[PDB]
C-alpha cells in the first residue's frame, strides 16, 4: 500500500509504504451500494426467521440501519413473487442500540423465484400485508426486544472511504457478541494513539501516563470491542474505563483518566457525543471535600436555560470531564453542583 502525506504550511511531501488509518467519523453517509448475500437468499433467511418466532431486527450500528433501508423495497418485490405474506418495515434508530438474544438463520434452499444481482433497474412496488417484519424503529409494542435478531451480518469486502463502492455482507453461521473487526483501525505512533471504527474515534496521549484525550461518537453501540484490535489489554480493571465495556469501549489502559471511573450513567441517549476534558462555558469547578458523591450526569443549564455557575468534586483532576451534545454541556459523574439543589437540574435517565 503506497500513500503520501502532505504538510500545507511547508510545501513538503514525505511518503512511502505502510499502514494507513483514516478518520471516517467526521464525515460519513456516502453512497454505498450494499450487497447482503443474495436477494433470493436474504428472502429465505427473513422468511425462515419469521416461522421460527423472530419478529424483527435490532440494529447494531448506523451502517446496518442504512443497509436495511436501501434493500427494503427490493426485498418486498422478491417475496410477493414467491407468494409469501410478509412485509419489512424500517424505522429510525435510538441510542443506545440494545442487544437482542436471537440471530438470523442461515437458510437451506434459496427460494426459487426471483432475480439475482442486487439493484435491479425497475420492478413493481409490492402491496402491503398483514404481517410485518420490523427493523429497528419505535415499535417495542409490536414485538419486544426479547424476540429480535441482533448482530447477524459480517462484512466480507468493502470499498469504504470512497463513495460508489460496493460492500458485501453475509449472514453468519455462529453466535457472537463482538463488533465486526473488518472496519476497525487502531494505531499508535510516538506519544499519540487512536482506537477507531466506522462510528467511534477515541484518542489518547502520554503526559506522565497514557490517558484519554478526546473521543467523538456518532453512535452508541453495545457490542464488545475485540482484544486483537486493542493496545495494552493486561492488568486492567473494568471499573476504571471511561467508556463502559458494555458500550463497545476498548479494554485498554488508553481508556483511562486519573481520578475518574467508569461513566455508566452518562448521557448515552444523545444522537452524537464528544468527550472533552475542559470546563464548560460560564462554569467553574473546585476540588473540595464537602461535595457530594457520584450520581447521574447533569446538564449545565436548567430546563429554562439558566446556567449553573459553581460546581465541585471530591478527588478529581482538572480540567473536568465534559460531554458536548446538541442540548449542551453535561458534566462527568463525579462533578456535582456546589450550591443549587440537584432536583433543579436535568439528569440523565439511562445506564449501561
Amino acid at each position, epitope marked *: 500500500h503506497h500513500g503520501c502525506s502532505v504538510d500545507f504550511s511547508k510545501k513538503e511531501t514525505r511518503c512511502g509504504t505502510g499502514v494507513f488509518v483514516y478518520n471516517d467519523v467526521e464525515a460519513w453517509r456516502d453512497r454505498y451500494k450494499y450487497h447482503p448475500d443474495s436477494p433470493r437468499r436474504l428472502a429465505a433467511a427473513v422468511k425462515q426467521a419469521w416461522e421460527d418466532g423472530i419478529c424483527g431486527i435490532s440494529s447494531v450500528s448506523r451502517m446496518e440501519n442504512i443497509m436495511w433501508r436501501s434493500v427494503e423495497g427490493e426485498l418486498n418485490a422478491i417475496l410477493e413473487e414467491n407468494g409469501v405474506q410478509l412485509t419489512v418495515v424500517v424505522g429510525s434508530v435510538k441510542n443506545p442500540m440494545w442487544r437482542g438474544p436471537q440471530r438470523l438463520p442461515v437458510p437451506v434452499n434459496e427460494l426459487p423465484h426471483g432475480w439475482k444481482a442486487w439493484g435491479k433497474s425497475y420492478f413493481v412496488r409490492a402491496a402491503k400485508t398483514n404481517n410485518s417484519f420490523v427493523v429497528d424503529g419505535d415499535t417495542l409494542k409490536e414485538c419486544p426486544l426479547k424476540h429480535r435478531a441482533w448482530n447477524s451480518f459480517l462484512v466480507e469486502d468493502h470499498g469504504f472511504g470512497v463513495f460508489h463502492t460496493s460492500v458485501w455482507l453475509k449472514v453468519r453461521e455462529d453466535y457472537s457478541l463482538e463488533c465486526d473487526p473488518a472496519v476497525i483501525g487502531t494505531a499508535v505512533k510516538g506519544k499519540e494513539a487512536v482506537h477507531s471504527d466506522l462510528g467511534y474515534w477515541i484518542e489518547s496521549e502520554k503526559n506522565d501516563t497514557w490517558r484519554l484525550k478526546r473521543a467523538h461518537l456518532i453512535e452508541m453501540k453495545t457490542c464488545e470491542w475485540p482484544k486483537s484490535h486493542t493496545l495494552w489489554t493486561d492488568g486492567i480493571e473494568e471499573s476504571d474505563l471511561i467508556i463502559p465495556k458494555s458500550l463497545a469501549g476498548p479494554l485498554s489502559h488508553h481508556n483511562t483518566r486519573e481520578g475518574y471511573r467508569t461513566q455508566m450513567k452518562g448521557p448515552w441517549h444523545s444522537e452524537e457525543l464528544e468527550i472533552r476534558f475542559e470546563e464548560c462555558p460560564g462554569t467553574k469547578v473546585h476540588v473540595e471535600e464537602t461535595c457530594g458523591t457520584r450520581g447521574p450526569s447533569l446538564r449545565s443549564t436548567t430546563a*429554562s436555560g439558566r446556567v449553573i455557575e459553581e460546581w465541585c468534586c471530591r478527588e478529581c483532576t482538572m480540567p473536568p470531564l465534559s460531554f458536548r451534545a446538541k442540548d449542551g454541556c453535561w458534566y462527568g459523574m463525579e462533578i456535582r453542583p456546589r450550591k443549587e439543589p440537584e432536583s433543579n437540574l436535568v439528569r440523565s435517565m439511562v445506564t449501561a
Partner: antibody
Amino acid sequence: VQLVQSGAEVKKPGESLKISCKGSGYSFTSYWIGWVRQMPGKGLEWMGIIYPGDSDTRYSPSFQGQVTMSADRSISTAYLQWSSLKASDTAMYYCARSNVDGSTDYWGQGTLVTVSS
Amino acid sequence: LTQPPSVSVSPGQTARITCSGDALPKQYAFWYQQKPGQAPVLVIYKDSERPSGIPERFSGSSSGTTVTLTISGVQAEDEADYYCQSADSSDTYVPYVFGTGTKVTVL
C-alpha cells in the same frame, strides 16, 4: 456536628418572635438550612430553605410573607422571625441541614411555640 | 406524594409502605422514621441505600412511579411514623415535598 435551637416560647397573638438555630462542628456556609413545621398530631411540612453566605431564601408558597428567614454568617446562627403571631401558629419548628442532593442529615431538638390569650 | 394512612402487623413478618408520586421516576426518594417525642431520623436515602447505624432489616425499592419501604422482621421497637420526601423542579420556591405519614403498629 450539631444544631442547637432556642427554648420554648409562650406568647400572645399580635406580638413578634425570633427563634435561632446555632450550628457548630462544621462549615456553616457550605450547606443549606431547612425549616420544617409539625403541628400537634399532624405530619411534617417544609417551610423553605436558606443558604448562608449567599443569603438566598427559597420559601414554600404557603409561608411567603407570613414568616421571614434570615441568617448570620459570622456567628453561625439562622433565624426565623414573625411579625404578628396568630393562634394557628402553635406547632413544633425544626431546623435541619440540607445537602445538595436533597438528604436532610442533622436535626435540632425543636422549639415549642404556644400561642394563647 | 400519597401514603397509606396506617399499617398493622404482628411481630415477625414484613411491613410494606408505599409512596406514590408522578415525578418519582426522575427524582430521588428518602425515608424518615420519627418516634413519639423525638426528631426525625433518616432511614433510607436515594430510595435504595441505608446510612450507618441503622439495622439491616431496613431496605427500599422503587418501581416506576411508586416507591416502597420494607421492614424484614417487625420488632416491638419498629413502630413509628414514616415519611417519604421527594422533589419537584423549580427556580424560586423550595423543591422538597413531604408525604403524609404512615402509622405502624406492632401488635
